[PDB]
Amino acid sequence: LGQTTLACSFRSLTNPYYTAFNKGAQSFAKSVGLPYVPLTTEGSSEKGIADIRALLQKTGGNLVLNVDPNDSADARVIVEACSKAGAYVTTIWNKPKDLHPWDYNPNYVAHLSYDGVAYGEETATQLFKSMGGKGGVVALGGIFSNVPAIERKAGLDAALKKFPGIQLLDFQVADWNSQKAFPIMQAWMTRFNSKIKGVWAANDDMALGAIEALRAEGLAGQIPVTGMDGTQPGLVAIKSGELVASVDWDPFWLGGIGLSMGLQAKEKKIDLATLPKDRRESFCTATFVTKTNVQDVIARAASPKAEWNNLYARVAGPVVYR
Numbered sequence: 001l002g003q004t005t006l007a008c009s010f011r012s013l014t015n016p017y018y019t020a021f022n023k024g025a026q027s028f029a030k031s032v033g034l035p036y037v038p039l040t041t042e043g044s045s046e047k048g049i050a051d052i053r054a055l056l057q058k059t060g061g062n063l064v065l066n067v068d069p070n071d072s073a074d075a076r077v078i079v080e081a082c083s084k085a086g087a088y089v090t091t092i093w094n095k096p097k098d099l100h101p102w103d104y105n106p107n108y109v110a111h112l113s114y115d116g117v118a119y120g121e122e123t124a125t126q127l128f129k130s131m132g133g134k135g136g137v138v139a140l141g142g143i144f145s146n147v148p149a150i151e152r153k154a155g156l157d158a159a160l161k162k163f164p165g166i167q168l169l170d171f172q173v174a175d176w177n178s179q180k181a182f183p184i185m186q187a188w189m190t191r192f193n194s195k196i197k198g199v200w201a202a203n204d205d206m207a208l209g210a211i212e213a214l215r216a217e218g219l220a221g222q223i224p225v226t227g228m229d230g231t232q233p234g235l236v237a238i239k240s241g242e243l244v245a246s247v248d249w250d251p252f253w254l255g256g257i258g259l260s261m262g263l264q265a266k267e268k269k270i271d272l273a274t275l276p277k278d279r280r281e282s283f284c285t286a287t288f289v290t291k292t293n294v295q296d297v298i299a300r301a302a303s304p305k306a307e308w309n310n311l312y313a314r315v316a317g318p319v320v321y322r
């Protein structure tokens with residue numbers, strides 16, 4: 001019986017969102033002096049669960065996992081594996097509607113998320129304002145089955161209903177990848193040309209991919225684009241006028257807090273069974289970012305006040321399901 005191992009599972013190191021997510025976990029392990037293990041699936045749900053199992057075995061269950069499930073289906077099997085191993089796990093973003101932490105006390109510590117319908121409608125509303133409320137819009141979505149992809153898209157469709165002057169030219173999935181969004185933006189410009197008066201992206205990486213295509217056609221900054229994540233590269237694009245808005249989930253914080261909750265549960269520092277539901281399944285507070293407050297968000301992400309000890313400081317409310 002040695003030290004507890006802290007592990008963080010996520011899709012890829014190529015998306016700055018996860019670069020920070022990983023940084024935060026790394027920083028939390030650092031603070032408590034526990035070994036850290038990053039796990040990257042690279043899009044393979046099969047690899048992600050395989051790795052988690054391999055780790056659960058080498059630690060004899062003495063593990064605290066903070067994972068962002070590749071797909072919502074993966075969440076249940078991961079949670080089942082941790083539960084039988086006696087390990088503790090926290091979920092981020094993706095999970096089935098029926099999967100609740102309170103059904104797996106105390107191993108399934110918590111699920112963290114944000115209201116994608118609200119924020120998606122927020123970035124979409126800002127985008128349409130920029131367009132004068134009229135014009136053609138193309139939209140890039142995340143992995144089809146992902147909960148945030150579904151919610152943010154739902155937020156978009158709602159902003160559209162409130163702006164009948166906006167015409168949705170075409171919605172396409174780019175799986176959160178800028179390299180997949182690039183060629184899609186190109187084909188849209190060839191297909192719709194001047195009809196495109198704006199671009200909505202389900203996350204920053206895809207927006208930057210969209211902006212790379214615009215830049216290649218000398219339109220970067222002339223066609224308003226929005227994203228979500230609030231990643232440093234996304235923030236830079238906002239200060240430069242190329243991205244009109246984004247939403248900061250604070251991946252750094254997400255990465256560390258997830259493990260913090262899990263570790264405190266394992267140490268019996270918190271009484272899981274007695275926590276309100278909104279502390280088990282939480283929608284967290286995020287920061288809408290635009291040029292007016294971009295400088296403040298940038299400064300935050302270079303001098304992060306790692307509030308690991310204050311577990312429920314950002315609980316906006318419980319996760320809701322339409």
Ligand SMILES: OC[C@H]1O[C@@H](O)[C@H](O)[C@@H](O)[C@H]1O
Nearest residue numbers: 017068093142148176203229
């Ligand atoms: O797994 C869900 C996450 O996937 C990331 O690629 C994306 O940047 C996040 O905003 C969230 O959608």
